Amino acid sequence: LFLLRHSSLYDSFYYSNYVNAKLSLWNENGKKRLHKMFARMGIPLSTAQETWLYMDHSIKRELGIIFDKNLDRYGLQDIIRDGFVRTLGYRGSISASEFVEALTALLEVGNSAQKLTNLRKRWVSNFWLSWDALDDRKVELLNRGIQLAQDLQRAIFNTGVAILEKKLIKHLRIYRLCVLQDGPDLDLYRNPLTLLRLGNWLIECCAESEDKQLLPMVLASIDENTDTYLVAGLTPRYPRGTKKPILNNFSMAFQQITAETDAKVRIDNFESSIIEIRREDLSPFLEKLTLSGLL
Amino acid sequence: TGRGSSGVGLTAAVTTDRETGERRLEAGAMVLADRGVVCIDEFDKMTDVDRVAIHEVMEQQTVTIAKAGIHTTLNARCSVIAAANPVFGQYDVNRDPHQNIALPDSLL
Amino acid sequence: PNVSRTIARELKSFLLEYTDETGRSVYGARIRTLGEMNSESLEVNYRHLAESKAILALFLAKCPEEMLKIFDLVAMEATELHYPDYARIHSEIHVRISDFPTIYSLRELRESNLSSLVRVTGVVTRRTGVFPQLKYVKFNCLKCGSILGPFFQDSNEEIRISFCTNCKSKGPFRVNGEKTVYRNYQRVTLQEAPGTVPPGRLPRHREVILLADLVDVSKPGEEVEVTGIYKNNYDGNLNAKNGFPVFATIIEANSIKRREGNTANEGEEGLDVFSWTEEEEREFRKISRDRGIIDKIISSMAPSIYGHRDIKTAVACSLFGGVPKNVNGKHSIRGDINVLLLGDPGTAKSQILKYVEKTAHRAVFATGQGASAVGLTASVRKDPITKEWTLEGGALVLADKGVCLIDEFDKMNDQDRTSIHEAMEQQSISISKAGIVTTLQARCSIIAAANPNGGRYNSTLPLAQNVSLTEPILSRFDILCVVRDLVDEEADERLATFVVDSHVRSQLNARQRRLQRQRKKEEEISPIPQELLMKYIHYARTKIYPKLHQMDMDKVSRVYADLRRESISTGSFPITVRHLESILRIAESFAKMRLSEFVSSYDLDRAIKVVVDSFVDAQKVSVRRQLRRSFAIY
Amino acid sequence: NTEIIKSFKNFILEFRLDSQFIYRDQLRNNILVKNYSLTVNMEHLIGYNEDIYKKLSDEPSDIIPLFETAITQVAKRISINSLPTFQLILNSNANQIPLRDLDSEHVSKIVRLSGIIISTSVLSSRATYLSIMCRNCRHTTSITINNFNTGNTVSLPRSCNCGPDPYIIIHESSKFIDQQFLKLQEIPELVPVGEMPRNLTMTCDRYLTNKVIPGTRVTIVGIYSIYNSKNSGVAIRTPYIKILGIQSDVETVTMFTEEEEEEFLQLSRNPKLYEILTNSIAPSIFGNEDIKKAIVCLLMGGSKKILPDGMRLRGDINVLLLGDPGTAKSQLLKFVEKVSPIAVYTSGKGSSAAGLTASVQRDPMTREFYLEGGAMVLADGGVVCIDEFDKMRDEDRVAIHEAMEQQTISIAKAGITTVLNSRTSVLAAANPIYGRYDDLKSPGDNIDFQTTILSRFDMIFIVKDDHNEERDISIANHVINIHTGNANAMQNQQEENGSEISIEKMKRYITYCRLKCAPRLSPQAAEKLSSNFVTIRKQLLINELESTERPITIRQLEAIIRITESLAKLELSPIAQERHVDEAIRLFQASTMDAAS
Amino acid sequence: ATTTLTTRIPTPAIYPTEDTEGNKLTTEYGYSTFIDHQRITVQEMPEMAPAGQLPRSIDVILDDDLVDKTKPGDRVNVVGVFKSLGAGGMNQSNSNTLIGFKTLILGN
Amino acid sequence: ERVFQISFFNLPTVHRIRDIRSEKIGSLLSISGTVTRTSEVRPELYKASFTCDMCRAIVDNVEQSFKYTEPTFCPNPSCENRAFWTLNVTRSRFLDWQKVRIQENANEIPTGSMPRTLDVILRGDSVERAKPGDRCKFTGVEIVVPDVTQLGLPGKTTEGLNSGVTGLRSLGVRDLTYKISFLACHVISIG
Numbered sequence A: 001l002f003l004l005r006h007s008s009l010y011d012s013f014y015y016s017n018y019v020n021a022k023l024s025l026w027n028e029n030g031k032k033r034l035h036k037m038f039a040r041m042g043i044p045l046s047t048a049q050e051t052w053l054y055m056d057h058s059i060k061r062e063l064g065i066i067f068d069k070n071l072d073r074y075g076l077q078d079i080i081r082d083g084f085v086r087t088l089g090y091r092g093s094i095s096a097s098e099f100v101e102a103l104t105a106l107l108e109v110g111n112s113a114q115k116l117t118n119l120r121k122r123w124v125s126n127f128w129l130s131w132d133a134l135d136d137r138k139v140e141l142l143n144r145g146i147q148l149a150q151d152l153q154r155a156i157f158n159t160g161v162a163i164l165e166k167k168l169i170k171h172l173r174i175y176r177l178c179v180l181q182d183g184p185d186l187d188l189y190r191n192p193l194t195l196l197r198l199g200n201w202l203i204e205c206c207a208e209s210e211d212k213q214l215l216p217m218v219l220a221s222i223d224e225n226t227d228t229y230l231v232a233g234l235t236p237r238y239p240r241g242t243k244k245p246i247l248n249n250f251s252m253a254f255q256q257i258t259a260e261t262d263a264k265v266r267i268d269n270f271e272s273s274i275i276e277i278r279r280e281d282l283s284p285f286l287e288k289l290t291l292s293g294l295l
Numbered sequence B: 001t002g003r004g005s006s007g008v009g010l011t012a013a014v015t016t017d018r019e020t021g022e023r024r025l026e027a028g029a030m031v032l033a034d035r036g037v038v039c040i041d042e043f044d045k046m047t048d049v050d051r052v053a054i055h056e057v058m059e060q061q062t063v064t065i066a067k068a069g070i071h072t073t074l075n076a077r078c079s080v081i082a083a084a085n086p087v088f089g090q091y092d093v094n095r096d097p098h099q100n101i102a103l104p105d106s107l108l
Numbered sequence C: 001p002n003v004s005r006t007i008a009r010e011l012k013s014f015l016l017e018y019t020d021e022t023g024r025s026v027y028g029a030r031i032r033t034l035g036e037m038n039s040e041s042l043e044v045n046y047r048h049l050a051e052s053k054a055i056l057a058l059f060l061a062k063c064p065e066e067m068l069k070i071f072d073l074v075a076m077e078a079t080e081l082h083y084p085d086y087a088r089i090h091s092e093i094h095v096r097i098s099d100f101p102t103i104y105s106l107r108e109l110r111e112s113n114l115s116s117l118v119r120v121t122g123v124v125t126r127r128t129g130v131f132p133q134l135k136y137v138k139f140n141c142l143k144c145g146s147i148l149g150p151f152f153q154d155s156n157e158e159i160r161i162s163f164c165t166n167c168k169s170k171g172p173f174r175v176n177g178e179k180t181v182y183r184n185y186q187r188v189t190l191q192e193a194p195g196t197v198p199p200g201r202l203p204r205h206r207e208v209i210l211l212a213d214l215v216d217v218s219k220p221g222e223e224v225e226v227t228g229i230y231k232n233n234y235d236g237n238l239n240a241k242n243g244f245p246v247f248a249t250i251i252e253a254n255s256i257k258r259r260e261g262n263t264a265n266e267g268e269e270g271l272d273v274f275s276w277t278e279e280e281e282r283e284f285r286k287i288s289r290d291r292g293i294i295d296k297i298i299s300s301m302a303p304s305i306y307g308h309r310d311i312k313t314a315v316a317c318s319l320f321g322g323v324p325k326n327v328n329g330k331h332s333i334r335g336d337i338n339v340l341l342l343g344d345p346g347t348a349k350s351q352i353l354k355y356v357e358k359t360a361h362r363a364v365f366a367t368g369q370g371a372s373a374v375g376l377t378a379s380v381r382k383d384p385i386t387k388e389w390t391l392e393g394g395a396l397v398l399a400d401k402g403v404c405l406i407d408e409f410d411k412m413n414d415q416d417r418t419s420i421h422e423a424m425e426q427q428s429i430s431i432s433k434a435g436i437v438t439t440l441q442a443r444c445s446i447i448a449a450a451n452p453n454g455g456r457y458n459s460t461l462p463l464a465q466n467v468s469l470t471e472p473i474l475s476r477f478d479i480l481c482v483v484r485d486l487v488d489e490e491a492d493e494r495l496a497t498f499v500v501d502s503h504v505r506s507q508l509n510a511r512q513r514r515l516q517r518q519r520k521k522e523e524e525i526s527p528i529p530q531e532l533l534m535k536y537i538h539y540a541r542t543k544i545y546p547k548l549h550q551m552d553m554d555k556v557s558r559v560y561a562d563l564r565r566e567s568i569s570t571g572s573f574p575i576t577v578r579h580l581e582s583i584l585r586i587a588e589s590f591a592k593m594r595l596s597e598f599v600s601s602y603d604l605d606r607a608i609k610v611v612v613d614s615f616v617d618a619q620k621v622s623v624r625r626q627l628r629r630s631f632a633i634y
Numbered sequence D: 001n002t003e004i005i006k007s008f009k010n011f012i013l014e015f016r017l018d019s020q021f022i023y024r025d026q027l028r029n030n031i032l033v034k035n036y037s038l039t040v041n042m043e044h045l046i047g048y049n050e051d052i053y054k055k056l057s058d059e060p061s062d063i064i065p066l067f068e069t070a071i072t073q074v075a076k077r078i079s080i081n082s083l084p085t086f087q088l089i090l091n092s093n094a095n096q097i098p099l100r101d102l103d104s105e106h107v108s109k110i111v112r113l114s115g116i117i118i119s120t121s122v123l124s125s126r127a128t129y130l131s132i133m134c135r136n137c138r139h140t141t142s143i144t145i146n147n148f149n150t151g152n153t154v155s156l157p158r159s160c161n162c163g164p165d166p167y168i169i170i171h172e173s174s175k176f177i178d179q180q181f182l183k184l185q186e187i188p189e190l191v192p193v194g195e196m197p198r199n200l201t202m203t204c205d206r207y208l209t210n211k212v213i214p215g216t217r218v219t220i221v222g223i224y225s226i227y228n229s230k231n232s233g234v235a236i237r238t239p240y241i242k243i244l245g246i247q248s249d250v251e252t253v254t255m256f257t258e259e260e261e262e263e264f265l266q267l268s269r270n271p272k273l274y275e276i277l278t279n280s281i282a283p284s285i286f287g288n289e290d291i292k293k294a295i296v297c298l299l300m301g302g303s304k305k306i307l308p309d310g311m312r313l314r315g316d317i318n319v320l321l322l323g324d325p326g327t328a329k330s331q332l333l334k335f336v337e338k339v340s341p342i343a344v345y346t347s348g349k350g351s352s353a354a355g356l357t358a359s360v361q362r363d364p365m366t367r368e369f370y371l372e373g374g375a376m377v378l379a380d381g382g383v384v385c386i387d388e389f390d391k392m393r394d395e396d397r398v399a400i401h402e403a404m405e406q407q408t409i410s411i412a413k414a415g416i417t418t419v420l421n422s423r424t425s426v427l428a429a430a431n432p433i434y435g436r437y438d439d440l441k442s443p444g445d446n447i448d449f450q451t452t453i454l455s456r457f458d459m460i461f462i463v464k465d466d467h468n469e470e471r472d473i474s475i476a477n478h479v480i481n482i483h484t485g486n487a488n489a490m491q492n493q494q495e496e497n498g499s500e501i502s503i504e505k506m507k508r509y510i511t512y513c514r515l516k517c518a519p520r521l522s523p524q525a526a527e528k529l530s531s532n533f534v535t536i537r538k539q540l541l542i543n544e545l546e547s548t549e550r551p552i553t554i555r556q557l558e559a560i561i562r563i564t565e566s567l568a569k570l571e572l573s574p575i576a577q578e579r580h581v582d583e584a585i586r587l588f589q590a591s592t593m594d595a596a597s
Numbered sequence E: 001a002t003t004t005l006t007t008r009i010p011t012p013a014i015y016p017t018e019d020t021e022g023n024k025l026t027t028e029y030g031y032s033t034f035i036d037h038q039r040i041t042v043q044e045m046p047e048m049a050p051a052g053q054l055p056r057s058i059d060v061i062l063d064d065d066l067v068d069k070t071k072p073g074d075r076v077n078v079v080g081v082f083k084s085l086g087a088g089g090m091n092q093s094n095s096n097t098l099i100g101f102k103t104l105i106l107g108n
Numbered sequence F: 001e002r003v004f005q006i007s008f009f010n011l012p013t014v015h016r017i018r019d020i021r022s023e024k025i026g027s028l029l030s031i032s033g034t035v036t037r038t039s040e041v042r043p044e045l046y047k048a049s050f051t052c053d054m055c056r057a058i059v060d061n062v063e064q065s066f067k068y069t070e071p072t073f074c075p076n077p078s079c080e081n082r083a084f085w086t087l088n089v090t091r092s093r094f095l096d097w098q099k100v101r102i103q104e105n106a107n108e109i110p111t112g113s114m115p116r117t118l119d120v121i122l123r124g125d126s127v128e129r130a131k132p133g134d135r136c137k138f139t140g141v142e143i144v145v146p147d148v149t150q151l152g153l154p155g156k157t158t159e160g161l162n163s164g165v166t167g168l169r170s171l172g173v174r175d176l177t178y179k180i181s182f183l184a185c186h187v188i189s190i191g
C-alpha cells in the first residue's frame, strides 16, 4: 500500500483493492470486505493532517497488531516489508518506495511522418524536467507529480475495469490475446511507459492459482493514423514461491516475423518487448504465432 | 420615487411603544414636502389605495387621521410633479386625445 | 435484582442459536453486516417476533424499558466475539423493534396504555433542528470534589438535588467542561394524518422526542408511524390551562419507518428489510445473465392489464432512468426521462399510473384541481410571533423520483404550467419570493395522463389541433403514447376473456399456507411476481452507472437527421436538439437492466424502433407511406 | 500549567526551511504596517504540534490563546508602551464533511466547512481590557478576557473590604473587539435526497472581519463550541462556530499581486482576443456567433459619468433572447452565472415582483420596521438573469420600470424613504406566442399590449429554425462527443494549454480589466455614427409610410456608443478607433434588419 | 449617564425623604434645575457607501441648545465624543451572546 | 385492580343553563344543551404515593385536591417532613378525562342575545362519548373551582370583588376568586 506517508489513505482504497486484486477479486467481496478493516475510523479534514500523518503510528502499530494475527491465518506477505526511508531535517519524511512512483508519472505528463516528429520531441523535453528533480530546489514541482500520480492510476483503473467486464480476453491456445479496439481516453497509450504498468495491473488480474498455462498476454491499442499499434508483450509472474528460467520467448519470434516479408513492420522503438504492426498484419501475425512454438 | 405603499401622505400609526408608555404618530411623507416639491411616477401602474390619498391632499392642504389614536389636523404645503405614460403605444392621434390614460378625472 | 443476569444469558442463546426458514443463519447475518457499515441498528424477525414475544410479552408490558437497557448490554457481547474492538469506535449500540400487532391511532389512548409499547401514525408537522444533549451529567461541588461522574440523566425532567454525599449545605451543583459525550435530540410535534379518521373534524396534537441515531430521518410533510413507549413525565406546571392534577404525554420513539402503502399484507411488506447478501445476491446475478430478460420483465410489470406493448416499455423506462451525469465547469445534463400518455376515456390509462405509485420507492399523487403554482414547488409559510419567514416545500422537493399529474384542468392550466415546464428546462429550479434567494435540488420525473377534448381522433388534423396545449411545454417530453381501437372481434375477447378471470380473484403452517396460496394466485402463468421484483429495482437505481462506446453511435446520425429532414419538410410538431438527447438516454436505460454498465448493439436498434414508430403513427391518413419508410430504417 | 510558553517562544524565532528564516522575516514585516497577525504553515508544526496538540486537543479553547501571550513577548524584542495583542489565522485542507457529523465526535475539534454566506449583521463590541472599582472601599484592578468557553468567561468577585458586588465598569481605560453574527448557508449541491438546507451562526475578530460579501463560495476552518442562551424541554443548548481563518477564494478592494497582471499584459498585446474568446467562453455551444459576442460585452460594461452638472448617463447594456424552444437560450444562462463576479439566478415566475426589490417586517426585538431583503441590492456591480416574460403581468413590469433606466429606487413603505444606490445589469429570455406563428404572421403579437418595455432594452436577438442539411449533422456529430466518451474534454484540454482559456482564468482578469482602465471614444468617430443614423431612421421612415407599425427610438443610438466603448475595455486602450467601431455596428446593423423582417 | 465623561457612582434614587431630623422635607421646584434628553438615529449618506450593503445607523444624545433643529431629511454634520455605557456580562448571570456595550455619541 | 364510580341517571326534571345559582350547589340537576369545541385526553391523579427522600419516600399520603402538588402530612419516621416529594409513575392509578364547553339549544333562545355558556369536566368512562354536535343531557353535580396560585411563573371588570373578602389565609395574601363550573358522571344523547 503505497504513497501513504505522502498522502491519501483515501485513494489507498483503490490500491488496497489492487492488493485484493492480488487475492481473489477486483471489486465484489472487497467492497464488502474492505469495510471491516477501513471505515473503522472516519477519515477527517484537519486532524487528518495529524492522524494519518502522526497517530496512524498508533494504527500502523494496530495493523502491525492486526496482521500479526493475520499472519498464521492469512499468510499473505505482500504487505510487510523492510524498505528504506530518508528525511530532510524538515519538510516531511519521504521514503524511496513512493519516490520512484512520482518519477514515472512525471516523466509521462508535464508537457508524411509529420506527427511522429512532434511526438518524439515531446518525450525528450518532458524527460528533461525530471532530471533536475534531484535538488532541494524543486519543492513545489515535486508535489506536482504526486498529485498527478494519484489520478493516473485512477485513470488507468477506470479502463482496466472496463476491459475485464467486456470479457474480451481469449485464451486461444498458448497465450491470451486482447485487442483494445476503442474505448475512452486513448491518448495516454502513445508513450510506452504507461503500457508496462497497464500490463503490470493486467498480469496481476490473472495472478490467481492458474495451475496450467502461466503465459502472459499481448495487448493492442491505436490512437493515431495508419494503425501504428504499439503492440507489446509481458512476462509471466510468480506468486512469491525464480526457479524456472522464464525470461522471454517473443523476441526470438520477433526476429522471425520481421525476417519474412518486410511488409510495413517496424522495430524502430528501442526495447525489443515493443514493436509496431499494421492493421491487416496483426491477424496474420497471430497465425504465424499460434503454430511457431518456440518456448 | 412614487412607490405607492400607504404612507405616501399618512402615518399608519407607527409608534414602536416609545419606551413603554408613549404613542407617537410618526410622520410618513408630508413633513418633508412642506414648502417644497415632490415627484412621483407611474400613476396608472398603481393600485386603488394611493389614489384615494392623492384626492384628499389636493383638494385640501391637510391630512387628518385617527387610526388607533388621536385625530390631528397637521398642515402641509405641497406641490406634486407627475409622470405617466399612455397605454396603447402610439394611439393618441387616431382616437380621442382625452381618456388617453383614463385614470379618474378627479385628478385631471 | 440478580436473576435478570441469567435472563440476559437465557435470551442470548435464545436469539442467535436459531434461524428460521431452512437455516442459512438469518440473525447472524443482520449483525455482521450492520457492523460493516457501522451504523448501530438491529431488528426483530417476524416469524420469531411472536415466539420471542410469547414468553416475553408478560415481560414487555410489565416493564418495557428496563428490560431494554438489560437487553442492550448483551448485544455488545453478541458481536464482541464476532467483531472485536467496538469500544474505541463510538462504544455504543441500541436495539430496535420491528412491526407489532396493533391497529390503533391517536384517538385511543387510555391510562391502561401508558408505560408500555405503543404504535401510532400521523403526519409530521413543523419541526426544530438538531441540538446536542448533555446526557452524562458531571456534577460539581464547590468545596469538595467537583467531579461526581458522568450521570445518567433522564428525558425533559431536569434531574437535580440540593445536597447528597458531599455535605448537607446549599452549595449548588454546577458544571465543568471535560469528557461528557453528547447525543442529539430533535423534537418533532405530530399531527394526526387525515386518512383513517371519521371526518369533518379537527386534528389532534402530540409530541415526539427522538433519540441519538434516529435524527432527521423523516422530513417535514410526509406520513410516518412510530413504535415508541408512553412516558408521562412532567412536574405539574402548565400555563395554557390552569394548574390542576393533570399530566401531559410524551412519546419517546424507538424506531421509524416510512410511507406505507396497500395495507393488506399479513406476514411481509411491513418493513423495508432490504438486505441482499448470501441467498438474494447470489440469486440476483443468475437472474441477470439470461437472454430474454427485458422481454420478460416488461411483460411481467403490469400484472392485470392486457394492452399493447410500448406503453409498458416506456413506463418501464421511466422509473428506471439514466444518469444525472456530471460535467466539468460547464452545463449539466438532464438525467431524467419523462413520458406522456394520451388516451381515450375508457382504456386503462388511469391504472398504470396508479400501479407504478406502489411499485416505486417514493411518490406523490397531485391530481386534478387544487394544483396551485406555489403549491407544487416550495412555498413560504409565514412566521409565528417570534419567528422568521421560513421555507416550506410542497410536492416536488419531496418527490425525487415520482409522479405528478397534469391532464386538463382547463381554467387552472395557465396558472401552474409556467411552473412545471421550467422544472425540466431549468432543471433543479427554485425561486425567491419575498424571502431568501436560494435554489434547492430536485431531479424529479414527470408522467402525465392528458385527455383530448372528446374522442381520441377528434380530427384527421394534427396534434396541435387536438390537444389544447401549445408547442414548447409539449416539446419537453420524449414520446406521446397514443391509443386506438375501433372494431375487432378477436382483440376484444382477448380483453374480454382476460378481464373476467381477474374478478374470480376476489397457525404457523396456516400463515405459511395462506402465503403459498397468495403465491400461487399470482402465478397462473408465473410472470416473476412482486415479492422479489421491486426489491432489485431499488439497487438498480443506486448502485450501477452505465457507460458508452463510440464505434456504433455514429450509425444513427443519418438515421436521426434524414428523419429530421422528412419531419421538418413534413411536420406537425418538430423534433429538435431535445429529442436526440432522449434517444441516447432511453437506450442506456435498457442496458441498465442487464446490470452491465455497457451499451450494446442489440439495444440501440431496440431503442430506435421504440421511438420512430411511436412518433410517426400520430400524424394523419398519410401514415401508410411512412411505414414504407421505416422498414428501411430497420 | 505553563512552560508551554517556553516551548513556543523558543520555537517560532528559529523555524525555517533551508536558509530563509521565515517567521522573523514576516513578523518584522508585519509589525511595521499595522496588522498584528500570523499564519502557520506545514508539517513539523504539525509533526510536534500534534505532540503539543495531544496536550492541546483536551481543550483547544483556552490554550489556543496561550499561544497568544507568547508572541507579544517576542514582539517587544523587535521593538527596542503602545502594544496590542495579536490574533491567529490557521490553514488545513483535507476534505469537507458538509453538514453531517455534527454532534458526536465534533464538539471542540477543528472542523472545515464549505458554505455560501448570505447575511451580515451590524457590528458590535465586547471588551478585552477593563478597569474595576470597589464602591465604598475603592479597590482598583484590571482583568483581561481573552478567549471564550459569547460573554461570561469569568465574573467579578465580591472582594475589594467594601460591600457585596461593588464592581462597576468605567469607560476611561478600555479596549474593544467586534463580533459579527453573520449567518452561514450550506452549498446547495452536496446532499440531495429530498431535504431543505439548514444554517448555523458564527462570530469573528476585527482583523478578519468585513472580508466577505453575500453571494460567494467560501471555505472556513474553526471550532465547534457551544453557548447557552436563556432567550423547550430539558436544559439544551445550541451550536455555533467560532471561526479562525477564511482562506477563501477570490472576492468575486482591488489589491492583488503582480505576476497575475504580468501574463495579462503579455496576453493583451496579442491582438486575437476578440475571436479567441468566442471559441473559449462556451466550450459546449455550437457556434451562434452573433449572440456570443453580445455576452462578453455585457459582462464588462462601459463606465459612469458624474459629469459637472446634476444629471448622469447610464453606462450599461441589457440584452434579450427570444425564440423557439430548443435553441439553447436556457442553458446558456447558467453558463454566465459561474463566470460572473457577482451573479444571482432568480429565473422563474418573477417571485412576487413587489417583494423582489424590498421587504419590511415586524421585529422580534423592539417591534420595528427596518429594511432587510432584496434581489437587486444583493446583485450590484454584476448581472441578474430572469425569464418568462409572457405570463407575468401582475407586477413584474411595474417593478422593473423604475429599477431600470435610472437605477435609483426609494422605498416609501412605513419606515424609511431612502434612495439606495443601484448599478445593476439585467438579462432575460422569454418565449413568443409559441414561436412559429410570430414568424409566420404580421410581426406584432410579442408582448400582449405594451412595447414600452421593448424600448427600454436595446439589444434583441430573434433566432429561428432553418433546415440546412449539413449544419445539423455536424451538430448531431457534436453532441455525442460531448455527451459520452468525453473525448472533447480530452481534446479541449489539449488545445487549452497553448491556445484556449479555461473558466478560472476568465473570471480573474475581468475584474482586473474593468477596475483599472477608463475609456473614451475619439472625436473622429463622431462623424461616423452621425452619418450612420440618418439613413437608419430613414430605413425606418420608409417603412412607416407602407402602413407598417409596431420599435426604434433614440436609446439605441446612445446604446451603440456604449457598445463601442465595451471592446475598448477589452483591449484596454484609452481611446477608440474606426476598425474598432466598424465591427461594432456590424453587430448592431445585423440586429437592425431582423427588427424589420 | 449625562455628565459625558466621568463614570461616577450612580444614585439609584428618584427623590429622598426625611433627612436626619424630625422635619417633613419640603422641596422648592423653582430653584430645582432641569434639562432635556433626545435621541436620534442617523443613517448613511447613501451615495458614498459602496454597493455591498444596506445603510447602517448609530444614534446620538444631544442637549437643549440644538434641539428642534433637526428636521428629518437634513444633511446634518455632528461632532462629539465616542462613548460606551452599560454593564456587559455581569448584570445578568451566564450572559451568553448579549452585547452590553452600546455605542453612543454625547455631542454638540 | 378495582376502581369504581357511581352513575345515577334519569332524574325527572330537566332545566336550562340560565337557572343555576343558589340551591344548586352540591345538588343533582340534569341539564340539556348542545356541545362545541372538545379537547384531548389527559390523565388525572386522585391519589399518589409521593413523599420526601429525607429518610424514606414510601408514604402514601392523602388529599389529592385541586392543588395537590404537596404531600406533606404524617411522615413515616421522625424525619424531615415537606422537604421534598417524588411523584412516581409506578403505583398510583389514574383516570382519564376531557374538558368541554356547552351551549343553549335553538328552540329556546328568546332573542339573539349573545347566548351564554359554561364548561364541564367529564371524568369516568364518559371520555370520548360526547361527539361534538348533538342535543345532549347530563348527570348533574354542580361544583365550584378556584385557582390556588401555585409556584408557576405568574402568581375592565371589578371581578373578584367577592374575593377581596377571601384574603388572609395562612399562606400568602392574594385574592382567590371562583367560577361556577360543572362535573359530570354520565352522558346521554337523545337526538
Ligand SMILES: Nc1ncnc2c1ncn2[C@@H]1O[C@H](COP(=O)(O)OP(=O)(O)OP(=O)(O)O)[C@@H](O)[C@H]1O
Residues within 6 Å of the ligand: C304, C305, C306, C307, C344, C345, C346, C347, C348, C349, C350, C351, C449, C451, C495, C499
Ligand atoms: N385493458 C384493461 N384491462 C383491465 N381493466 C381495464 C382495462 N381497461 C379499463 N379497465 C378498467 O376500467 C376501469 C375504469 O377506469 P379507466 O382506466 O377506464 O379510467 P380512465 O378512462 O383511464 O380514466 P382517465 O381518463 O381519468 O385516465 C378501471 O378501473 C380498469 O380496471
Ligand SMILES: Nc1ncnc2c1ncn2[C@@H]1O[C@H](COP(=O)(O)OP(=O)(O)OP(=O)(O)O)[C@@H](O)[C@H]1O
Residues within 6 Å of the ligand: C331, C332, C333, C425, C426, C577, C578, C581, D284, D285, D286, D287, D288, D323, D324, D325, D326, D327, D328, D329, D330, D331, D479
Ligand atoms: N448550439 C448548441 N450547441 C451545443 N449544444 C446545444 C446547442 N443547442 C442546444 N444544445 C444542447 O441541448 C441540450 C439540452 O438543452 P435544452 O434541450 O434544455 O435546451 P432548451 O432549454 O430546450 O432550449 P430553449 O431554452 O430554447 O427551450 C444541452 O445539453 C445543450 O448542450
